[PDB]
User: Fold this.
Amino acid sequence: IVGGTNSSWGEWPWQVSLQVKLTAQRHLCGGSLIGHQWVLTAAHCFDGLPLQDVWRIYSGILNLSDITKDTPFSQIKEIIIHQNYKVSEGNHDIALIKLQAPLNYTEFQKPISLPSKGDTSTIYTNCWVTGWGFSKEKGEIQNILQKVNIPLVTNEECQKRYQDYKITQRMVCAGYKEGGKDACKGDSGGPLVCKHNGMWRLVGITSWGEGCARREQPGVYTKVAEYMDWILEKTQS
Amino acid sequence: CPAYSXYLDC
Assistant:
């Protein structure tokens, strides 16, 4: 996250860290708890490591540096990537993760509310993006979960800044014209949440963007409302 | 890697 600030406990209890353990362990992507055994993230997080064995999912954690060999984590039972996902264009950048064991819900580990299929037209005015990614281009993973408040931008405005790629109605953009606040490397898969009526709703999944926090270069997110049929089909008992 | 990838190793 560029231009953000440090989060406190319980602000973002759905936020998870997807880590890979090969010879060393490292955070690779964010994700959102949506059910006792379900995490929604970006398909691109599994480009390269599509097998479940190397993954460890940490929930109920604020500060990655607080993680030790005794910290509990979840394992992956199944990775469900959208069938139409295309790496080069970032279309259908969405994946579900089934956890091997259901998590108990706590004030620091609980699901985010998902939008309604009709929310495709909803205007959200108070949106935030969170994660442990770089605080600047060519930066480093951040220890404390960062948060930043960013306005949503129209598809029309977003398309102008990305003439080399199509911005679809299944994508939502967010960013400042003067830049300075944005997601970045390592925030991939994490949530874009909007607050209305005291309730938080998952609106976007961090997907792609040119650089980080550059002027007139909004970030691109998977628009969750546009995948609600897919999500409910794939998570059906 | 995609041109505007956020993937850490990209």
